[model samples]
Target chain A: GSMASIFTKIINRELPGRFVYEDDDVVAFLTIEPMTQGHTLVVPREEIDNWQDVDSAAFNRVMGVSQLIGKAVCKAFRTERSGLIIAGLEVPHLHVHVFPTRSLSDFGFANVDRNPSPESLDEAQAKIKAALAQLA
Target chain B: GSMASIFTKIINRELPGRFVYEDDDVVAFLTIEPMTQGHTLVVPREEIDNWQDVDSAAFNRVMGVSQLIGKAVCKAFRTERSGLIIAGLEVPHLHVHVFPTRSLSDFGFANVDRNPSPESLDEAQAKIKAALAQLA
Candidate 1:
């Protein structure tokens, strides 16, 4: 059997994660290292490594969930809009980074918080989850 | 009526563009500044400003075409994978940047070729167009 990626572990509940949205095919969760408080990663359930290799149907679900979470992130953070990025250099699993944005600088990972407090992470998760419910 | 974006002008043939793929809903063309040779911008036909504001069906079409072009870009450039970014800060209209990426540095716009020759752009366009046709 093939080994599961870190994302697969998170999706399977083997690793603790602050989840905001989840379906059979896709899930959105707060990343440990966040560019913003409400930054979320939308991922397909399957362990596809590259965005280009993701199945079209699965990719649609990924982006659909991503957009929904993008809207939630904007509302949660009271931002103008959300940014989407797929630079899969770090992770072998496909994940779409969706975070509230007001400028091009917001899109870069250079300033991402590497050690956000767990309590702070929970608060951001709660805000985004509430926003997701409102959007639902 | 809303003013057409630079991308909209290119889509409407008001400005010269090196196109690789186009349909009723979406279009992909080479960027004047190439991150690599086959860096392409996938855009919606309608002049939607924010990507998060793009209609769900339209967004689906956008990503679908983007994935197609991503695959073509990888093949055309012989790269590990193609990158996707929707910063949506430079242009008011929405656009997805899909380009051949070999590393994290390739994801940044810092080293983009600001003044690529027309002949070089044309050659990149031809390679990606050929790859798109092969995928088709």
Candidate 2:
């Protein structure tokens, strides 16, 4: 059987997630496996599998959150560029990854930390939320 | 003198625009001058000069719509990948170019058409909007 969607679990409050953005349509939060200090995932609340399967309206909402959070990441971390990626291969659900990228290498999966400390994740989340607050 | 913002002119009915999507924060319309049959532009309502100047919330809103329209273009026109380019050099306004691009050569300035028939542009716009509607 396909594994239970980790994101769905997070959405249902079965697991802990550092959520920064949430609405009826979607949610934005920090990723456990981060490419950089402030890596975030913007995902749809619906359970559509794969990018191709995601409805246009739901996909648009997810991307809107992604761009919004990406801008915050850029401001929070002071990176040169913010990378956007949609690789649905990793999980069946549609999700967009937004990270504060300095160079092309920051996008490489090889550069990511599979296990990051809670203290570090907290610090990154604080900076990102602070940036969003500035916009508000 | 800097030309009046093409989007503002469209919003005010001062100039012609083949609008596809319109909401509070942004608008998407067929490019008067198109690089291809389906070339369109996504612009924010706010007068942000460049991509770097746009705040995170607005940037995300524009991107969400961009991805939605892009997917529609891909499905309707049978293109390999939608070419997305953000060039703020010519216009101080922040806008993204969405075109049905087959190869790198499609991006060349020589390929763009400054004048295309209204019927053809309307057909393309209808096709993309239909695809997006399917997503809804």
Candidate 3:
């Protein structure tokens, strides 16, 4: 029996994800565990276990959306810098993190909040979606 | 007489650069000063002086190419991790460094070699280009 990927659950509407962008190839959403404001997750639609396991086409598609959402996050928050990260150690599925970064230290996992308020997450979703709408 | 931008010098045949990939919006080339074995530069064709000065469209284009080239570098070199950095503090022009990184200390400026062999640089360039071509 195949275990459903956490991201797949989010994509299938079984698990909740504050989705920002979705298409046939990829999905972008807010990270439940955010390191800073405007943090997002760009995950491939396919259930690739590791970063290296993802094919080039799927990898590029995930990165494309990651860049798009990173831009939107930066614009919405007026951030000085934006950090892009891929840490496939914990989760089996591949995902990239896009966050509004001020410095290099912002990349550290120690700063992440495992649990955040629903209201704060909703506000972040609104800001990022607004930025994307402007680009469209 | 207006001096050519560093990238313009590289693109217009004024200065030497080990180019790996070139598209309308940007180009990827090996760095003169390398911190690791597979260090490369993703530079915009237009001479944007700083990251803050770069518009959204241009930023997106540069990042798209960066991701494409970064994956190639990872495949060519057996790197545990790939580092993506935008340190716009020094150079007036906007560029991102995609390097094979092991730890945070891999990014330390003191670790960078000001002088690397032309032969080694050429080899790295050829390997990266070959990897990208494989993707194509």
Candidate 4:
């Protein structure tokens, strides 16, 4: 008896995910649960429950990629700030939630839109993708 | 009409800090505003506003130190997990909040103990320092 983390499914392409940025060690995709537009999660492809236990090399990679994605998220959303939240409470996988934060409340979970329209998520993902290319 | 960020003051030694771990580039110290007993903040010597704007070299160093502090916080608090949250909403300077997390609540700021006792803060600081030493 066993189960797989949702992120694992997303990385494997077994589940639907709109990726804005990705590398060998980490992948960046739009979050299903988002407070605002351009909310993204930068996650390590290798599933490791305890984040602190993640190898320093891999952890660094995650953070490194997070910075790039974070920058793009801000640029795409035209926000003054971004948030990098690493809360591995629900899922056992290591992931960094990078999102465009206009205000402090955007960084909190209570404001998340659990059922955001697919078209909006798609537009948000598209904007970040364009920003990443432009920034590069 | 201007003042230094509270963190810059801590690094300048103009204000007191309970340091658990420190290096030439970065310093790990207990936060005046903490979510729980073992909460801490890892900050860079140089003042950087947006974390995405932080140079990769400095960013990597911050992430490296944050990982170690995250480990220590969990051990000090005997918690199931630790969170690495970097949301410089109020302050323009960059910093990472690493703290013991029993659940999702610890990841938010509204629940933080803004009025934690001097004794409790000192006790928490002492515990983390002890944990870091033992961990090393």
Candidate 5:
């Protein structure tokens, strides 16, 4: 009768997601459309659209988990740094782009591989998951 | 002789900053170089370079304050959305760029006014501070 957000579908397992981290309030997974090899998205379980409007506790949880995944992405991809972006024009749901980066060029969505292969996405997920496991 | 980071100078009042919010560990101010009219930076008092390396508590505080400033910025600039970015390639200190945004194109540094007029910066700072005051 009602439609679910794309992220909700992923969170609910109705759609595929390469999850690297999950908690009660938040979850992080590799984005199929990636700016780099280890690009990940940290999202809240609640369907908050604007990052500015996210409540303090929930926003803290999202950023905290994002930092963990960011560290893992950097380690997994061997990038010089990790970048976080919250420009939520495309997705109505709140998601933080925590991705591996070597330069400012990696910050924008202009150059993302919109049609990355499932195999590449899987490999990137495995690498990030292994890195997260090692960090733990 | 020793030198401080550009942000450190602003924090220490060695250089001027159009501050909108400040606390013991974090501060928010308008960036002289802005992607949009009301772009602000939320910075930790600690000189942490990489965001991924920021401690959990400090990161929480930064993101919390950033959400506040992001809200003020969107309200101040009358924008559709606010964007938060952490691409620290330029500055060696940790600072989150919280700015008003209308679209994905507003998310980059490529088109920032390198020398925004002092009057314009002052106006933007006043608007954001007034908005923050209203929120408070």
Candidate 6:
């Protein structure tokens, strides 16, 4: 279903994406409908509908990368907390959403800036990539 | 800090919790403020504040059980979907919420039944336990 998933488009470069990090097993990119600018998705290369069915090795890598991204998000955005979410409801592919936050209210999906400008997305990407490298 | 975690209290039988499944590393139990009848939390034995802070082995086990619980929740409640969430804003411990759901709105924390009767929780736990073994 790679052809169907928007994530696949981002991974394949068929669609534009603000990619921050990638390794052999997983990729981290900014979500279009982000609650905050630092919001990123840590997704496995292999497509899976549910996270429960994920292989141990792949899932570990996803979480491992997510941990690093979480640290970066918290630091980059200057938020006291980083909220992690796994909501496959919109996309069938397994992904971990990491966003900086001060409270649970920061997690409302419907409250996102779905129509963010390209200029803002590019700026956000550059900012996050710098912090990710700085922390690494 | 182990004694400070309410999950530790529930695990040690100091406080009450409707435990549906358990092993050496992870425990699955019904949350008092459930979004639905079968809403459960798959948590690690260690009291890590966030999932990103959890050790790989412990995190892996928590996920392994969450997957099983997700399968069980879907079947027991007759929902086509199971919602998995990790918004640890209230508690400083890592817990994955697994619940039967039909839509994304079922995920809203404000939609939870904060005053659910103990009788229904008992019923839900019994039903889920009966289905848990049938999977194996």
The best candidate by TM-score is 4
Would you list the clashing residue pairs of candidate 5? none
Comparison by DockQ, 2 against 3, better one: 3
Top-scoring candidate (lDDT): 5
Query: Model 6 chain B — which ten-residue stretch has the worst lDDT?
Result: B1-10
Candidate 3 lDDT at B106 equals 61
lDDT, residue B93, model 5: 83
User: Which regions in candidate 4 have their CA more than 4 angstroms from the true location?
Assistant: A1-5, B1-5
DockQ for each model: 0.58, 0.07, 0.12, 0.66, 0.73, 0.50
Residue B14 in model 1: shift from native, Å?
3.3
Tens-digit lDDT string for candidate 5 (B9-104): 777888888998999998888887788888898988886878888888888888889989988998898886898999888877889999998888
Better of 3 and 5 by TM-score: 5
- Candidate 5's residue-wise lDDT over A1-136, tens digit each? 1213665678779888889889888888887778888889898887788888878888888888988888898899898789899988887888999988887777787778978888889899899999999999
| Better structure of 1 and 5 per DockQ | 5
Candidate 4 lDDT, A1-136, residue by residue in tens = 1223665677789889999987777788887778678888888878676767678788788888888998898889888788888877776777788888867666667668977898999899889999999988
Task: Report the C-alpha lDDT of model 6 over B2-106, residue by residue, as the tens digit.
Answer: 423766678668898899998887888998788888999988777776666566667767878998998898889897678777777777778888888877677
Ranking by DockQ: 5, 4, 1, 6, 3, 2
- i-RMSD values for every candidate model: 1.6, 7.4, 5.3, 1.3, 1.0, 1.8
Model 4 chain B: lowest-lDDT 10 consecutive positions:
B1-10
TM-score for each predicted model, relative to the true structure: 0.90, 0.54, 0.62, 0.93, 0.92, 0.88
Alpha-carbon shift of residue B127 in model 6 (angstroms): 2.2
In candidate 3, list every pair of residues with a backbone clash.
none
Residue-level lDDT for A121 in candidate 1: 92
lDDT ranking of the models: 5, 1, 4, 6, 3, 2
